Design a protein around this ligand. Sequence first.
Ligand code: 4UW
Length: 529
Amino acid sequence: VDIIFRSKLPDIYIPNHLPLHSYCFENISEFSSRPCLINGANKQIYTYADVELNSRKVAAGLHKQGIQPKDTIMILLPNSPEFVFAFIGASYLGAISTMANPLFTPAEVVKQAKASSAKIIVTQACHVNKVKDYAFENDVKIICIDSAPEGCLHFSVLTQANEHDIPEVEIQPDDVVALPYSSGTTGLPKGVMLTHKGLVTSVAQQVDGENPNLYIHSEDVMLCVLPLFHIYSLNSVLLCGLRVGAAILIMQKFDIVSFLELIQRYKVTIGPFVPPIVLAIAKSPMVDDYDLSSVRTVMSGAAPLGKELEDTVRAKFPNAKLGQGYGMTEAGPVLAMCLAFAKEPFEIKSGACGTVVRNAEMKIVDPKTGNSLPRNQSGEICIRGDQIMKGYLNDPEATARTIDKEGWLYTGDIGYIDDDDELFIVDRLKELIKYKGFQVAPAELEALLLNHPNISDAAVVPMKDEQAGEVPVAFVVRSNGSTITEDEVKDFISKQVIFYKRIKRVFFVDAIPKSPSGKILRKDLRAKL
Ligand SMILES: COC1=CC(/C=C/C(=O)OP(=O)(O)OC[C@H]2O[C@@H](n3cnc4c(N)ncnc43)[C@H](O)[C@@H]2O)=CCC1=O
């Protein structure tokens, strides 16, 4: 029998039959006039009423541009009001948003645009060159938020539209609404189909209930420095923030001065961070010149924090509950959330990544045997519930390998649950690398390396790094007669990928350590490092 773990919080009613917009704005009449988005770039503020209305106008605009239910748009933007209006606008149409880093190479963007079948790309003028040729050849519309080059439209063509021109649509709970890309537990980035039902469930698991797991309310100011094109910010900052009527303070990029100035000046109360931000707070000499006493909740996720740094950063935020959460794109994303964040808080231990969310089930499985494990025994973390993905777009094989027929998602993370129902992550079984919380899929990098005519074999694995948590390093087997150097390998990769995917070290070997069956012994390579 599977040994099943659940939250210390009771299950709640979740209205996951509601479309995401209908759910997120369900209580909007209670905070219509309250600030919703604050753009750190220009200090422009949109109220809840403004955001709902602009989203509805954009929906009508998108429909006029040809977006039908189940069509997809690509958002290729930094954190911005336009990101939000495009995402929620598509939701109103029963359509799908795929989201991508605007700093991706042209090849990276176009690959995602093709895989997702994006009909419209929403971007900035400076990035039009990345997609222009592709878009022209395939009649994909380009909409720019600042200025529109030839063959492009301005975003105002969407906001000029009449909100009463949203077509009648029957959106189903299992309809897809968000399509972030993720490599999962092996291989290349794949399209994660997140549904109305799934996202409503995940948001509710965090912020709903008499005692919510993550207590946020309409007088909070939540910093949105994490990128909305990644699932952490999209779900736990934007969608959760909207649900409870909180103000969301948008930053386009991390800048330590801007970060501190904004926290102090806007009296930020919720700080959704990642470990490298926590590291910057612990290291920077200017932090002591700032008043950060407004912050009541500091969250870290996406990568391990580690007891030491966690304990330390409580000093810089004297009034804050500090804790970790644990997410994975395929999981909706939140698997576990710190119960110190609850309206009626629980005791926690440093180094834990939370307690499994309510209205969900977790098990811990020995990778060697397939047997479920009891408390205080490490194995592969698995979760099930209505919050998880529908599956991978056009990839039933990858879906079948990732979620079993009993509904269990296998995370590829190794951890244990203690006597207090706190989850601790101790290792990663899957090949995924995390650079500052960003996904780096070794399979992508290995594919590039293998296609170099002077490389015979390659393996990319994480190396521990203070600043980034992990950096990608490559083990390379040179082809016969090859003289390719570490720098030449690095440059070859550097010219083809976004900065965070860059190989930081190259180690040249006679053979890649492989199992008898020829699978890369990634754990062995990690051990060598
Ligand atoms: C504050 O808590 C929250 C966290 C997240 C994390 C999302 C994420 O990272 O997804 P993805 O890019 O697919 O990568 C998923 C993989 O990242 C690792 N990871 C994640 N959180 C941790 C952690 N606290 N400790 C150690 N490792 C971790 C782990 O390997 C996981 O499978 C979302 C929302 C949220 O509220």
